[PDB]
Amino acid sequence: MKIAIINMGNNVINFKTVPSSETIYLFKVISEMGLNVDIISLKNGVYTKSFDEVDVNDYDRLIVVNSSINFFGGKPNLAILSAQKFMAKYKSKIYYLFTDIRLPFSQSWPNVKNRPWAYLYTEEELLIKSPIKVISQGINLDIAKAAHKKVDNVIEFEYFPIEQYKIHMNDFQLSKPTKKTLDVIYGGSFRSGQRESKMVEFLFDTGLNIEFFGNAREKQFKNPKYPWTKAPVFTGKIPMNMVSEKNSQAIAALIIGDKNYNDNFITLRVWETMASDAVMLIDEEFDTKHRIINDARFYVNNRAELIDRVNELKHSDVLRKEMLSIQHDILNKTRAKKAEWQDAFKKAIDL
């Protein structure tokens, strides 16, 4: 049984970009599952083979990682174009890994014909006619179906917790008790709107020692509806593999609500935080049914509650350890069902 996996809109060669890294890690976890799989991209390399040099029909299953398919500066994007040509030459069912609400499968032909360079491609060459099965990271399938309502060749839907691939990895490890230098830590990037609102709510004017790492600066929060006086310390981007170690420096780490995930998608960040040495506090709206941790003490609804919970954690090293052993126990128990997770995955791709 031969399996092929590709990314539909980004080049894949090594760990120089986030999407190339994700595709390679997915490839690794699939292999550690005992399956024979190849990554197919624009060129040969340590982890890949070239589109030009393979017969897409030698593979029994073709897995496709979701991505956006816009053409930057109005120019041709080989990654997208080449991937869709490959998918178009495939004559069996295609498996679409849907890990982000914003990246639903989409035909690129309708947008190509209107470009001045349309003569470089034909409809038979780009239009993907094979049936498509969406493998949803999100547990709500109605939402998955609503996002792919514009493409009818997408006929199947199934939920699979894809984002657990990092904790099931062979060389994965949990954090160890770390010297604390922060009360609260949060990672992310700025964006106006409700996001600015949520961030100002939980991380500004708290009186606590909060650090904010990622693509965000004090000068970007300007909405007059979300006024603030004291801001957290912004430290900018970190190395790709430093999330857990970064969180381990704080008593608590926060996960904030976001309509793109709420009560649907569990994210990679949730596992990165849960595995750290910091107590994971979650915005109630992100998981109202408490699917993540069935203990209300890990959930906060607003600023006052966040301050309260964190001061409780600082004044009682006993409470901190107990809550910490509870989240780790959940993670360990989840890592103990690896075989079930693997089987569930094989089943999902019809093996």
Q: Find tokens 């990554």 and name the residue.
A: 39
DSSP-based three-state secondary structure for 134 = strand
Structure tokens at 273: 């935080």
What range defines the domain where residue 132 resides? 1-166+333-349
- Catalytic pick from 156, 172, 191, 218? 191
The letter for the amino acid at 91 is: K
- Catalytic pick from 32, 38, 60, 100? 100
Give yes or no for a contact between 37 and 30, defined as CB atoms under 8 angstroms apart. Answer: yes
345 and 317 within one domain: no
- Catalytic pick from 22, 183, 272, 277? 22
CA angle at residue 255 from 249 to 256, to 5 degrees? Answer: 135
- Helix H or strand E segment including 330: helix 317-335
Measured torsion, CA atoms of residues 276, 279, 283, 284, in degrees rounded to the nearest 10: 120
Structure tokens at 11: 């080049």
**Total tally of structural domains belonging to the chain:** 2
222 and 131 within one domain: no
342 and 289 within one domain: no
269 and 162 within one domain: no
Which technique was used to obtain these atomic coordinates?
Answer: X-ray
Residue 247: which CATH number?
3.40.50.2000
Specify the DSSP class assigned to residue 346.
Answer: H
110 and 37 within one domain: yes
> Does 100 qualify as catalytic in the annotation?
yes
DSSP state letters, 169-205: STT----------EEEEEE----TTHHHHHHHHHHSS
235 and 110 within one domain: no
How are beta strands 49-50 and 61-65 bridged, if at all? unpaired
237 and 328 within one domain: yes
Query: Residue 223: how many CA atoms within 13 Å on its side-chain side?
Result: 14
- Catalytic pick from 53, 55, 72, 340? 72
**C-alpha distances in Å from residue 182, one per residue of 118, 135, 213, 233, 247:** 55, 39, 13, 11, 9
Strand locations in 137-230 (E): 154-159, 182-187, 210-213
SS3 percent helix, strand, coil of the chain, rounded to 5, is 40, 20, 45
> Does 291 qualify as catalytic in the annotation?
no
Kindly tell me the number of DSSP H helices and DSSP E strands found in the chain: 11, 13
174 and 162 within one domain: no
| Burial zone of 142 (CB within 10 Å; 0-12 exposed, 13-18 middle, 19+ buried) | exposed
233 and 310 within one domain: yes
Distance CA 184, CA 24 (A): 32
DSSP-based three-state secondary structure for 255 = strand
Distance CA 201, CA 137 (A): 28
298 and 155 within one domain: no
211 and 162 within one domain: no
150 and 17 within one domain: yes
Resolution in A: 2.5
